[PDB]
Amino acid sequence: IETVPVKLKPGMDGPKVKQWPLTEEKIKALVEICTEMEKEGKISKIGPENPYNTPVFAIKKKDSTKWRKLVDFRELNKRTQDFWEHPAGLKKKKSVTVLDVGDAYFSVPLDEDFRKYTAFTIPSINNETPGIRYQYNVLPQGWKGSPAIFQSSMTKILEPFKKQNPDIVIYQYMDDLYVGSDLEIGQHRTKIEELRQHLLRWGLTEPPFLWMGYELHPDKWTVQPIVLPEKDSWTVNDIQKLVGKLNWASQIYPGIKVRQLSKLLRGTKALTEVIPLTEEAELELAENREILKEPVHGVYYDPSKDLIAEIQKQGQGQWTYQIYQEPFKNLKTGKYARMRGAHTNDVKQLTEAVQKITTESIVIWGKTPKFKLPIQKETWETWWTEYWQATWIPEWEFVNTPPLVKLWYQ
Amino acid sequence: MVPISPIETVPVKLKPGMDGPKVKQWPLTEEKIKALVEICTEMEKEGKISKIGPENPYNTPVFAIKKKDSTKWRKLVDFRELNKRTQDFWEVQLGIPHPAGLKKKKSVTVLDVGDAYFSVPLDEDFRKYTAFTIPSINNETPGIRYQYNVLPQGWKGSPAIFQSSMTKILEPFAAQNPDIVIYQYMDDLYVGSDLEIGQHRTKIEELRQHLLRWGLTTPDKKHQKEPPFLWMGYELHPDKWTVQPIVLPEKDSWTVNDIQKLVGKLNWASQIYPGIKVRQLSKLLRGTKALTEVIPLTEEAELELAENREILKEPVHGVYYDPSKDLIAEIQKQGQGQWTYQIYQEPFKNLKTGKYARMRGAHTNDVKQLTEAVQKITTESIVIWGKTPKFKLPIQKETWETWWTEYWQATWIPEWEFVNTPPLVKLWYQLEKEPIVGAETFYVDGAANRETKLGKAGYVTNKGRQKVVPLTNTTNQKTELQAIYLALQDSGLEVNIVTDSQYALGIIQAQPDKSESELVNQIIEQLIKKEKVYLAWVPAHKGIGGNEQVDKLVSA
Ligand SMILES: COc1ccnc(Nc2ccc(C#N)c(OCC=C(C)C)c2)n1
Secondary structure: OOOOOOOOOOOOOOEOOOOOOOOOOHHHHHHHHHHHHOOOOOOOEEEOOOEEOOEEEEEOOOOOOOOOEOOOOOOHHHHHHOOOOOOOOOOOOOEEEEEEOOOHHHHOOOOOOOOHHEEEOOOOOHHOOOOOOEEEEEEOOOOHHHHHHHHHHHHOOOOOOOHOOOOEEEEEEEEEEEEEEEHHHHHHHHHHHHHHHHHHHHOOOOOOOOOEEEEEEEOOOOOOOOOOOOOOOOEHHHHHHHHHHHHOOEEEEEOOOHHHHHHHHHHOOOOOOOOOOHHHHHHHHOOOHOOOOOOOOOOOOOOOOOOOEEEEEEEEEEEEEEEEEEEEEEEEEEEEOOOOOOOOOHHHHHHHHHHHHHHHHHHHHOOEEEEEOOOOOHHHHHHHHHOOOOOOOOEEEEEOOOOOHHHHHO | OOOOOOOOOOOOOOOOOOOEEEOOOOOOOOOHHHHHHHHHHHHHHHEEEEEOOOHHHHHHHHEEEEEOOOOEEEEEEEEEHHHHHOOOOHHHOOOOOOOOOOOOOOOOEEOOOOHHHHHHHHHOOOOHHHHHHHHHHOOOOEEEEEEOOOOOOOOOOHHHHHHHHHHHHHHHHHHHOOEEEEEEEEEEEEEEEEOOHHHHHHHHHHHHHHHHOOOOOOOOOOOOOOOOOOOEEEOOOOOEEEEEEOOOOOOOEEHHHHHHHHHHHHHHOOOOOOOOOOOOHHHHHHOOOOOEEEEOOOOOHHHHHHHHHHHOOOOOOOOOOOOOOEEEEEEEEEOOOOOEEEEEEEEEEEEEEEEEEEOOOOOOOOHHHHHHHHHHHHHHHHHOOOOOOOOEOOOOOHHHHHHHHHHHOOOOOOOOOEOOOOOOOOOOOOOOOOOOOOOEEEEEEEEEOOOOOEEEEEEEEEEOOOEEEEEOOHHHHHHEEEHHHHHHEEEEEEEHHHHHOOHHHHHOOOOOOOEOOOOHHHHHHHHOOOEEEEEOOOOOOOOOOHHHHHHHHHHH
């Protein structure tokens, strides 16, 4: 009930980010939502003396039909003071369910002198009426200060369940609670259902998206092995691609040699011609296969550095990705083919991939990576909001020159 | 007396750390002083300004300007200092409607509400910063000191505070009269409706009545203006819209400034006149910044202009948006990186038109450009209509499918259909995914001496075909390309090419159909003639013979 004092960083003013164009249907939904939020006192109309702005839009969470207001607080998050005034067990857990606990934030009042900085505008079609201007009175969803200012209340609400269940790992990121078990899905969903009773009990002391449960599990390799083909007959082209792959891998694994295989490439042969491997060549290949079974040397996560995620489009709905802090020191790699209702839409697939990778990232390190997206800026920025279903938003940049490396992950 | 409702003031502050203005009051003539004192006495009586004591230390200069062909004066308060020191505001009026987004109305009336400006009070604690001095005659008494009580003309926050105050007053009227629509713009209120002129004129009178609740005076039913309306470079009618006359000047020669003007008019015109082109004309504005320089028009620019005049010979109008119908956008390729489009709902009645131009870059292709044009139209359509239009595009469905499924980037265009209007966008070559059996294999390489710019390019093949060409004034990059070009020239219709050039791969994998580099262009023209090309990359300096053999030759 007593607000926590918040300021910006020294020498930084509040966010002044342009509102981007919204479709009629998103505008209609934001108007209905904000009208109700105003009645409930969560937000208030503001006047022209407030020059700040943060973009707003609307999404639908995964497997739901109802519009949800999403504020893009990325700029405010950067400019908001850090609040110092990660559960390694989570990734190792057998299963994790993700809960939208953001609605809880709305019960905590927001510091009066900070509210101006949460200004947003609902635009009108064709600028025929003035944008409707609001600011928050309470902790807004998507602001980094919100979990940090609610963390005190949150522990008190979870003290029983944790004392009652010392096995379940519980992690909070932004508007999400990550609840990891080792139990069976029936126990799991029930124990999840159990946890839903704590916030209804506290709730009346009604949430729109609190009921949903998003289910996930870890996979076998953190970093996928680099594998080389096993063949009985090698063509010149097969050997050229092999030497290319190994040269690349030698940037990551220092013992890799290609002299004895390259020597097979001595001469000017037809690309489809079959070349018998020499005994020196087979040993070298064998030696390299072995080297590739070992982990990478000198790879460590560092919380003081940014996570970087690269994605490649592999075709036929398949995507590969790598997460690192230093080049050639991958912390996690992966491959996806599983994209729903996107079979003829690249951009929807990529947007889903970005959301999946970001989720994995939050689980492993408790922070989001900066993406390097294989897409033109203008295409991405036109469409990504159509397919976004998460309540956080990572940073991204754009790759305009085709990496030669796509093969090596294929 | 009927009580009127007060207009709630908006709290204003100066920028942090900054203080108000302290600027010297100019020496005036005895004549100008007399005129200002008259004006100010009237303004003070009306309530617009008030006399302040010696306490206030802030000052803003005041001037008097003689109205042309008259004998009366005008009061001008130069607020430039106070504006630099006043806080930033939310400036709504940045976004204005595009006429194509308006809905057709039976009647549209404007009400001048400029007189409300002076009925809008200024925040009490901010007034002092607006202080000004009327100098006295012969400077023998204290200057008369005044501060403003209402929003001053030329002060930073007046436009935004006025509009917000007006919006607040209008909200209940608009919301309770949903069969009319109000649009605010500076001094004016535009009111449109599909009612009978009887009902309509009545809603207008009721609005005047509503405005009086706050004591806001308005003009009589003989409102000063009726349609057509001249507004922001457009002419608006209740059922159609256009831009104000475009007149391309006759000239015996053109200078830098004239061309830019010419560009601008063409650009403004292009939102409704289809087909307009400005490429050749915009090519004459390159780099230089001397507006005086006369530029000769190329035969190209001369013909583009003649094509422009013909399009401008007779007037064109746009129609208004009908929410009950689909939006259709049709695109044509014009050449030289230029694209034109029309947006409509019924055949032959455009809502608006427009154009798109190629982004600056070394290599490009038509499909990529078509895709950018689509995105641009899409975003513009979201602004104007709140929805994406259905697209009619000059690219076969099968062509699009081959493009996006094989392109290394993610890409998407929204719901569209093929329209068969030449020239069609197409894919000009497609590289093989696997090596071609029975096709000759060319191992290519090129290298150049950094100091002398002397190089060699060449190939060796599996049939013993070989070539090395000496080259002058070249670089490693150009020689790597030249080597690929020679392999393309000297091979049959099917060919496998092996290169170590990451640079050449990077360009070819980007699938250009046109280049700034004439060497890339020559490579593209060869690629077009082939039946099958497989391009293989290998790492340099590795003992990969063929490559090794050819590197030795060209490194010599
Ligand atoms: C007034 O507000 C609105 C809102 C939506 N559609 C229209 N239609 C509409 C139709 C015809 C004319 C005319 N003439 C017109 O003029 C006023 C609007 C301006 C000045 C942008 C407006 N007017």
